[PDB]
């Protein structure tokens, strides 16, 4: 219950999107580093390199 | 009823074991934060008599022995020093973990 | 005193949009 | 004249740590057995040092 | 009756312009006493660098006599009456007041007029006082404090006029003579750059009299067509350090650049400034203060004392934090003081939001008790706003500050900005800049 | 509104003015100064000073802390060898709990062992930070080479004292001191109905008489701190009359006559008898003024002077010769006119600021019990006559001198070649 | 929970056969049960009975 | 004028001392701060005098000799 | 530089014992300059005594006219060859001092020791004086230290009226201290806190009663036998033997023997003792007091 | 100073750990107490007690002709400057003829100390001194007093 309150719940809601965008930079850097076919197959550009 | 309790906790105070070794039951606490303060705030005699039983509680430990019979420390008489300064610390830090989430 | 110390000339030093020391400062901040 | 055990960087170093370490008085021989399994590993690295010299 | 209606039951200041320009204000209350202050647009930005010190001459020889009263007549006339005179200059303004009893008001006027418009200018008084503005920066150096303020604004201001402090270098306190003491008086000394402000057991209408018939036609020409401009200051990130290890504390200053008196921004920043606060060895609070910072250091043993300001000039400022603290904690209490300012900048919370805003509160209303402080409100107000800010308006801005207009507005001030570091004392574990500036973003934001 | 007092049977003062301040403003006057310790307490005065944010019967430290800076009140204590006053300002929304923390502070203490340990070491920073500057250690030695038993207490703990003082002690102290009959609540901007309230609910446990005082008693003497600085600080007071006298008016009239302070900033006191005098034949810089401290019980009246280590004898014989001639009789009617008004506008310039309001009403309370109107003040200021300075000026040159002097004392003069 | 470890010793000892299911599914089912359950409620109990709480 | 700031002008704030137990809102001038003063050294305690006999020669009565040497001990002669 | 330090530790083990600060205080209190300086060095001077201030001192004050080089063991003409080796090139008389003018008064340091010491001192005669030698006897007949372990002191006058209205641990004797220009004379008392004035006021009226001059002439050949051994037990030791020999040859420029001292001792009348009590008595007075103070009297209510 | 002859007393000085110390021979009828006592802060104690056994253990296996010249005069200096004064006379004779039957005379003594040399120094320390089980006497703040195994270990070297 130490987590659990008003003041934790808006430092939760502030910090909502700055983990959501760090997520996204994990995600896309994970299918960077792995070539994921599975996203890798939609964006136009990097289309081309798979043929 | 509370006789037959009083009595399973004789028997059970009897199998813990820290009355033959001459310690209490607050001298048997473990020493988280909390449990710190409660030593700091303790005066300088309560202090010395903890250190001293806990250090003759090391020592047959080391010798692998106990004390007497006579000398074991009874249910009775096991006095609960840091039980109110233990209690006042965890009111403090509840009251700060209040204001804090408040 | 303290006063007769001057920070000395850094023009030659300086990046081309902080050279004016009459033109504030924080519309290329953003740039630089 | 200086005390070498304690002003010898690498000697002052295993002092700190191997010697001159306030231990506690009783603990038993189950505490023999960090020492064990280290000297375990040293044997372990000379022996299959010589098992890959020869292997 | 509320804060909101005693703040509107706080009496509003009159304000009426003679026909030089020169701007009448006043605020009545029920007090015995008065205060009537002249407030002068002139100072450190205005002086070039050849006058550098010459505000400060005029301000120290404004009471040594005037050519009505010459010699001491007009301090035995003020010591008669029972009145208290003083003056100050700071980079912008120049004032000079007197606190007095309401029925020595047109005394009081009459020997303002002639402080302001009469000062009398003998060579024996300027040698004299040469010495004594010599003495007094000597002790002024004594002092602390006042060197890192003064670094500050040298290393932040930088090639314009506001980095040159109040005093001036030493050589130009040396050669600078009576002719350029007189020059500034016949340049910066005109009716349009001065207010008469009152505050106390004053009427307006004596008060505005009393100026007709005294500071009328005070000087309200230049003399030669030519009003000086006040350009813009550029600010520039920086550190100086003033190295000497033999001192027993350390001063280290860290600021970036403020909006300036015109911004509405200024009530944001002084509630963060608020959150933030000051510190001391003399406060009992302990380890149960509201600020992080304050805890943390008597928490640590970290710092002798901190202090957060938000000094403003004409669009420009400084706003940041001063300490004092041994020499081996600078590095921690760096880390800790941007640790909080980056704290306000990305999850203030609405709990030390409101805190701040009851602080800033409490700050306002504790300043403008007493006629003194009133009376130079009231003269720094039409000085810079050019008008009165009631305390209604004040509170209102202060209502209208939440949490997410503070780390909106801390982000814009305080983020990823390059600061001036001013650095006295033992300061070798002060950081170098580009730690500080690392200091000054987080990876995480 | 207007100021109004009642006196609750217990032995209570209530002041109350309803000006519509932004900022209600309530203090609690105690006679509790260091005047009431003898040499077995000494620094429990100190220590209940730098004690007012300590755990309560009611409210911890931590709440009480928390809550004040959160209201965004303030909490101080201003204490003289007299008296002790506690103070809380803040908003008018928040008063309520303002009183509520400043009366368990002031009524129930729990004073804690590890809490005034942790407090002890405060207090030695509190004392090195006061003796910073040289005048409080001139002005603290003067009275305890001045007086012999009561006001000869420090307002600062001895340095042995640090470490001695206890939680009982404390306890005895609040208990002996913090009585009904010895204090007296001012309130400013807070309704008299609801300051009678909480006083009625958190001043219903000790209404006692408290513990007397002991007399204070003269010995007068010199004493010298050899400390090798450039400027020699010496005061040279008497015994004088005791607050609230006509005499004791007489008294400021001098000081303000001789010189109590600068009018004009950087001036040369044009108008001081004391710096003229000084300056008549002195060219290194001084700085010379009368001092002037009355208590219920007694009074020190004298002249401080900072000056050069070598001009320090002739700094001190120009001004004590000031004093003999005022004493004679050399003297202007218009000189006492003109420190008249001085003393007068010192005295509403003391009072146009809310802390100097509420400190006057509260040592008003505590004196009398009635508050006096600043016109009536006014009106014995214009009644003390230029024979009543004579006659206070004679009075301090025929008593017999204590001196404090700090500095290179080389040539610093003792008292008997004064 | 050491003779719960013996048993799972021994159970990968001898293959996958009966009655080895059955003895290796309880083994592990109390293995689980012990470690995360029943020693912290023993904790509990026993500074109930210690009058801690 | 019954108040130590209405009589003494320029010696209220040393003739009284005052402490914030809680900060204000607004900081006052000349905040303060010791500069690490340091510590008188940690030296032996001298025996008491419980009894008279052993009180009794404690009384000085001859003038003080300092003495000190090479390699003997610095003695206090009274 | 690095001797400093060394100073301060040194200041610190003399300030061990209360009664090294107990007589620096009343040196102080006594005299207003040339006697009253310090024998130790202050603290605010520590840190800040030079190199040129030491050679100042020492080609000032370290002369050949102030100087005697004294020795036991050695030859007169190898002394008078060191002498005329190393000690001509001194200049002379040098500087002179400052007379060492009296003032009084008294200063009380509450520190919350268990035991006051209280030292009450006047002027009194100097070294070379009939005077000086009657403070002596003076001193000896109303107690300058115990001539038996864990004893009563018998014939201590000040012990005996002490323990006559007391019970309690005190200690109390007769303080002298004569110098080249000006004396001190007077009583020290280490008593209890709560009976610290009895103590004092006791010890004060046992010398106002010899003052009156109730005193028996076989106590004041006592008090002589008493002087006499102890001067005789100084000079028996050769370190105290040639401390003696060399401080008459600074003060007096001639060696007198030891049956000329007692000789002299003996000529001290019993008339000489009442005038030295009568003008300790009538004389100023100095006090040092310190410990817990909330019972000592002052100097006016003696 | 940091140049006192005494080893031990310059490395105490150099290095700030003790506040004193001192060396004692009591003796009583065939017995006796030899070694030394030292008052230290609670920092310094385990570096006290290393350099003074190191100093005691110098003296056992390499001592030095010139430091045994001047221990001789030191000690010849401290028996006649005890034996100046009456009342220390009146002592030794009692201790003497208490002790050893009869009074030792100076020339007897000053005998002896010249018999002294460095050999039979080494000798005798090596005999008293030299892995020897000691009395360890301790009050205070001593936790950081060595353990008597250590000094024990200390009572012995391995390079000798
Ligand atoms: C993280 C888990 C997913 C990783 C992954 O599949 O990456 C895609 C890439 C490439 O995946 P892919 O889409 O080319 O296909 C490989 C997967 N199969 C054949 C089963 C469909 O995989 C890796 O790089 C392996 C990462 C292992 C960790």
New binding site residues.
Partial sequence: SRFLGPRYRELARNWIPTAGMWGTVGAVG?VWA?????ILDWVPYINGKFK | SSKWLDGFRKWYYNAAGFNKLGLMRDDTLHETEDVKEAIRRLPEDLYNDRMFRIKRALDLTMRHQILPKDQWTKYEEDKFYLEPYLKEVIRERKEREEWAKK | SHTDVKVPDFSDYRRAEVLDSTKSSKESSEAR | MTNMRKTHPLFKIINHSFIDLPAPSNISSWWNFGSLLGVCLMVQIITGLFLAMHY | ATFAQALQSVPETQVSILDNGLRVASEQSSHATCTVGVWIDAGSRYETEKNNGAGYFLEHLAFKGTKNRPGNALEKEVESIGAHLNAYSTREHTAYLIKALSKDLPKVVELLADIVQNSSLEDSQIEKERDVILREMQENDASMQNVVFDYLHATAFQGTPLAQAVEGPSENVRRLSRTDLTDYLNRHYKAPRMVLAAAGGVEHQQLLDLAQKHLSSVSRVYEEDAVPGLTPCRFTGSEIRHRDDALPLAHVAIAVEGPGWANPDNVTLQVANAIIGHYDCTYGGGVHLSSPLASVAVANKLCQSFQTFNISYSDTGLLGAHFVCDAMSIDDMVFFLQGQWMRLCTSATESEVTRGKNILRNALVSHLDGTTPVCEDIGRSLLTYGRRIPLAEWESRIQEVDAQMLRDICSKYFYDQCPAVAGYGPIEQLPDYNRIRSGMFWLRF | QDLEFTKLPNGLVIASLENYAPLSRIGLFVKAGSRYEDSNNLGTSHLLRLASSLTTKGASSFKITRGIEAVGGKLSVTATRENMAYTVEGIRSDIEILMEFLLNVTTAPEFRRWEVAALRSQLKIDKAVAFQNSQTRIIENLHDVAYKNALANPLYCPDYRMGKITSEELHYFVQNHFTSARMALVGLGVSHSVLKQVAEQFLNMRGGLGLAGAKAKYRGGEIREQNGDNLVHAAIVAESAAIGNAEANAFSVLQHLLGAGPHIKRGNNTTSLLSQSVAKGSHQPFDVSAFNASYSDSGLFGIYTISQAAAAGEVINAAYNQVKAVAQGNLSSADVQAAKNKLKAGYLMSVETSEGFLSEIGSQALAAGSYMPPSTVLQQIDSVADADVVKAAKKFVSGKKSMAASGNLGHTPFLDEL | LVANLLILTWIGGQPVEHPFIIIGQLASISYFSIILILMPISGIIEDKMLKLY | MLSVAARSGPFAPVLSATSRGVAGALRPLLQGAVPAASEPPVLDVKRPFLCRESLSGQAAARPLVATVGLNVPASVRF
Avoid: I
């Fill in positions: 994970l792995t070539d994921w076919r599975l």
